[PDB]
Structure formats: structure tokens, C-alpha cells
């Protein structure tokens, strides 16, 4: 198939202790502009970092000077890390991500329900994060008295949002929750007749 | 740093004592997969991605070696300064709208985790059937967060964390 490649952690030459290393790729306009930043962290304090803008390692605390100075010297390491912007970032965006993260689209489920009252529009289980959720009253956009959660991250590659409108139900009125999202050909509109 | 997407690749975390490590990939905030360091198996968050891409778990193992190594050296370099603990915060919320007589998933979201060892449990009595924990996630400030999942049959629940940077365990009720 197509394969994910990870960076190569550079090596160096009760009470507890923690090491962490990460490779961050920053894509803007697809792969039109990539930034590559790789970080070495000891006990929550970042101490070394490469950054493709600088083009070379730098020490971020004085624990880091040994390694940043060392890795900068030996070109089999520095050239390799510089080239990880393509061998890792560009390769992964263009390859596996295009077949997975960038192709994923799950549309949301919308349900309205009463809770001077307040209706709640529950919009769940969607991806990616872009979504617009508007209320209409009898066909007029209601922006006063409407309040939404922030985007809530479910951890399983799905989001949810809940939009509460403050209302008073007079027998005959129609309130419609209106949801636009990249996964829907036409918007979703769910009505609640009073 | 501004961008449309961010892939956070090759996240290696090692901690001693205990010899505890973790190797994960993430995209846009979401875990693509981790490497199981005992079964030496790449396990994907969504099986569907495992059917559409791959990652050789061995590149995780080697990287954990490096990071074990580095951890040994820096431990000594700083004259063995130890890790300083943190107070974690939990927030409990449901996956779908709750409907009694209908199965639902209940999510516990712990944050400000450091170091990355917590016990995340849950009637007034412990419950172990049908829980999925996530792996540790990366925060801009190098503490971690993690979500636990309990499957409930909504009727008519609390989330218990035991960390070290918490003097007595913290229970966030629902």
C-alpha cells in the first residue's frame, strides 16, 4: 500500500524523569507551503529544536547546546533532518493522508428537542470540523437568544456541537435547525412545529 | 504557527523509572495510530485507516530505543533533576444525545497530565466492563491529555482520576 514514514529521533552521546520527541509538519494550501519543526523535550521543558525556517538545530535551553552543536556538525544527520520535510511531511500528506485523513467525510446527525423555554439542536458525529448551524423561526434567521457550545472533540475522529435557542412556543410556529457542512450536498434542515 | 493542517508525526515519549513508552501519530489533533510496544503491533484508531494505509511498527521500536537512550543521558546531564508533577482536570460529557433505553457512550476528558501515568476509573462502585482509554495526546505546553470512554445504558456516574500531582483522587460526577 502507501505508508506512513516517521522522523528519526536524533540520538545524543520516587523521582521520575520524562523525555518526549515530536515532528510537526505545518501544511498551508496542501503542500504549497510546508514548515517542519522537530522538538526534543526533557521534563516538560523543551530544550532542543530544529525548525526548517532556521534550517539548522538550535538550543532552546542551555541543556541543548551540546546536542544542537553536535547534530549541526555531522552532515549525515543535519542533511537528513532537513530532508525530512519531504521524506516525512510532503510524503505523508501526499501519500497516506490523501487516502485517509483528507478523504474522510462523515455527516452529522441533527435532532431538535425542547429542554419561555429553549430548544436544543444536537449536531453530532461529523468530520471535518467545518460546520455552520443557524436557527430559523417561521423562516426568519434567529440570531438573538441563540448560543452554541464550542466545537467538542470526541476523540474518535468525530465532532459535535449543540446550539440552544431561547424561545417561547406558540401553537403554530415552526422552528428549523439549519446545518451546512462539507459532507452534505444540500444543507440539512430539521423542523420542530410548535 | 498558522497552517491549514498539522500532522504530528513520530511522537515518542519515554519515562523512567518504570520503562514506560509511547509512540503515536496524529493528524489535525486526532490520533492516527499508536505502536503497541509489547505486541509490537501498529494499532489504528479507526480500523478503516489500517485498511487504507500502513506503518511498520519497527520504526516505532527503534525510535523508542533512541528516546530511552536520550533519556538516560539527559537524566544525568542536569545532575538528575526530577519531574515536577501537575494537577489534572477532568470533564465528562456524552458522545450522542442521551436517551434512556438507548445505548450511549460517555466520555471523560482529562487534561494537564504530566508525567503521563494516571489511573482513570469510574453507582458508588467501580466498573470495568466496556471502557476504552485513548493514548496520551500532546498539548502545546508539553503536558498531555487523555480520554476514557464508558458505554452506558442511560438510566435513572462519576469519573475518578488518581494521579501524583493530586493529593487525594478527584471524582467528577455526572
Amino acid at each position: 500500500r502507501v505508508s506512513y514514514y516517521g522522523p528519526k529521533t536524533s540520538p545524543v552521546q520516587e523521582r521520575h524523569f520524562v523525555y518526549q520527541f515530536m515532528g510537526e509538519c505545518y501544511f498551508t494550501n496542501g503542500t504549497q507551503r510546508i514548515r517542519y519543526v522537530t522538538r526534543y523535550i526533557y521534563n516538560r521543558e523543551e530544550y532542543v529544536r530544529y525548525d526548517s525556517d532556521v534550517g539548522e538545530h538550535r538550543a532552546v535551553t542551555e541543556l541543548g547546546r551540546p546536542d544542537a552543536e553536535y547534530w549541526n556538525s555531522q552532515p549525515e544527520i543535519l542533511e537528513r533532518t532537513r530532508a525530512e520535510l519531504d521524506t516525512v511531511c510532503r510524503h505523508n500528506y501526499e501519500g497516506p493522508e490523501t487516502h485517509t485523513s483528507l478523504r474522510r467525510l462523515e455527516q452529522p446527525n441533527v435532532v431538535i428537542s425542547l429542554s419561555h423555554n429553549t430548544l436544543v439542536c444536537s449536531v453530532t458525529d461529523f468530520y471535518p470540523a467545518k460546520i455552520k448551524v443557524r436557527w430559523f423561526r417561521n423562516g426568519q434567521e434567529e440570531t438573538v437568544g441563540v448560543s452554541s457550545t464550542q466545537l467538542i472533540r470526541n476523540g474518535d475522529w468525530t465532532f459535535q456541537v449543540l446550539v440552544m435557542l431561547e424561545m417561547t412556543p406558540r401553537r403554530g410556529e415552526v422552528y428549523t435547525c439549519h446545518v451546512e457542512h462539507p459532507s452534505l450536498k444540500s444543507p440539512i434542515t430539521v423542523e420542530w412545529r410548535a | 504557527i498558522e497552517a491549514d493542517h498539522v500532522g504530528t508525526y513520530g511522537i515518542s515519549v519515554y519515562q523512567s523509572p518504570g520503562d514506560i513508552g509511547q509512540y503515536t501519530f496524529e493528524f489535525d489533533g486526532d490520533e492516527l495510530f499508536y505502536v503497541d510496544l509489547d505486541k509490537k503491533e501498529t494499532v489504528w484508531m479507526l480500523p478503516e485507516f489500517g485498511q487504507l494505509a500502513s506503518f511498520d511498527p519497527q520504526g516505532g521500536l527503534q525510535n523508542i530505543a533512541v528516546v530511552k537512550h536520550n533519556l538516560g543521558v539527559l537524566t544525568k546531564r542536569s545532575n538528575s533533576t526530577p519531574a515536577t508533577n501537575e494537577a489534572p482536570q477532568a470533564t465528562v460529557f456524552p458522545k450522542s444525545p442521551v436517551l434512556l433505553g438507548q445505548p450511549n457512550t460517555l466520555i471523560c476528558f482529562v487534561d494537564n497530565i504530566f508525567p503521563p501515568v494516571i489511573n482513570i476509573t469510574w453507582n458508588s462502585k467501580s466498573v470495568a466492563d466496556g471502557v476504552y482509554e485513548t493514548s496520551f495526546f500532546v498539548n502545546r505546553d508539553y503536558s498531555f491529555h487523555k480520554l476514557s470512554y464508558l458505554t452506558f445504558i442511560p438510566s435513572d456516574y462519576d469519573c475518578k482520576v488518581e494521579h501524583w500531582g493530586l493529593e487525594e483522587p478527584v471524582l467528577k460526577h455526572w
Epitope: S3, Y5, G6, K8, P11, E76, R80, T87, V88, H91 | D19, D56, Q58, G59, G60, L61, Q62, N63, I64, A65, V66, K68, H69
Partner: T-cell receptor
Framework: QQVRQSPQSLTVWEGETAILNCSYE??????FPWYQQFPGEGPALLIA?????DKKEDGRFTIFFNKREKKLSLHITDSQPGDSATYFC?????????????FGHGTILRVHP | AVTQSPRNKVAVTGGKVTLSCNQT?????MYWYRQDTGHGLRLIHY???????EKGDIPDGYKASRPSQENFSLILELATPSQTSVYFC???????????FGAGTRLSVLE
Amino acid sequence: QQVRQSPQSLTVWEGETAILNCSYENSAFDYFPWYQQFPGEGPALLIAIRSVSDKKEDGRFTIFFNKREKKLSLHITDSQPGDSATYFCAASVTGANTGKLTFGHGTILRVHP
Amino acid sequence: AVTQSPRNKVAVTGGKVTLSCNQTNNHNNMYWYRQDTGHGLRLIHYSYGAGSTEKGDIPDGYKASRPSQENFSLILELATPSQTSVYFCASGDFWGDTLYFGAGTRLSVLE
């Protein structure tokens, strides 16, 4: 992913040029090192090429790489009888960070004095 | 330097053999290969550091052990005729372009 070397035995008179050929199947191979094994010892690195590279010179030994045809050749010029050895072609996908190298079955080169 | 012990060993089916390999380049990865005509150089087991151990391409019939950064051992609990061969040990750095081999050990396992 199998690496396939030809011929199995090559015999040459001193001064000739030996041609040892190697081909692979996995398109992801990007590092190709040749290991020389003398009788009774174990192999040592002779000379290596990366995929971004068209040719690699080193004294009397040269590697010719062809990415499109997935083909690879070691030339030994001015064949000394001391070059009599088994020569192995290898390849790794360096991006997979795995550390394992895939090995040809090697060609036995006997140089005649 | 990379040295293996023993360099030659005779053994009978059912016995337990132990090849041992020591290395002094402060290398982190260690490997155990096997060489036979018609089969080239096959990987049996290897290791990225002390305590860990990976199954190469033909791990059946052997178990390996890396107690120390400098030490990698290769054990045949029930030796078989088919395990008659010439065994090579190696090492390398993290992300190393070079493997560094030992001088080999001839082993015959006979009925």
C-alpha cells in the same frame, strides 16, 4: 522486495573489469550497500549508493544505479586477484526506520592471476 | 570490535547450543544472521537495545537474548540438523549506514 543478483559465479583474469549485477522489486528501496566477504571472515561494507544518486565512485569500484529499471551494477576495474570474494547486494527502505537490510544471495568472484 | 564465541562447535540433535556475541563500538543495534549456500544471509533475531529483541525473517528454532548493550546471544534449545550453518553477528548505530560483522562461527548438528 526480494533482491536478485547475477551471475552466481564470475571468473575473471587479472586486469579485466568485473560486472556484478543486482535488481530489486520493491520500489521503496532507496539505499543500496554492497558488502564484500573474504573466505573465512564475515562481510564488510564495500561501497554504497543512495537512490537520489546516479553513480558512486571509489577507487577501482563503482556502483551504477538505474531507478527506472530498478537495476544496479558494481564494476571492478583492474581486477586484482585479491578481489576474489563473495559480493552481496543489499537494500533498505530507509524511511521505514526499521534497521533491517535485505540481502542478495551474493556472487562469487574468483580473479585469476 | 565485534567478536563471537565459540568459533566452531559440534553438537548433536536435541542438545542446547548457545552462540554469544560481544561488541565494543557502543553500538545500539545487534543482529544474528545465518549463511547457507542457496540462501544468502538470513536474519534470525536482532535487538535495538538491552531487554528488547525482535524476530527476524527466520526466527523459528532459536531464541535470542540481549542482556547488555554490548551483548547479544543466540540460543538453540533443541538443536536440529537443519540448523547446521555458519552464523554471523553484527552491530550498528542508530540509523546506521553500515553493518559490522563478526568473523563467524561454523556449527554442525549431527544425528
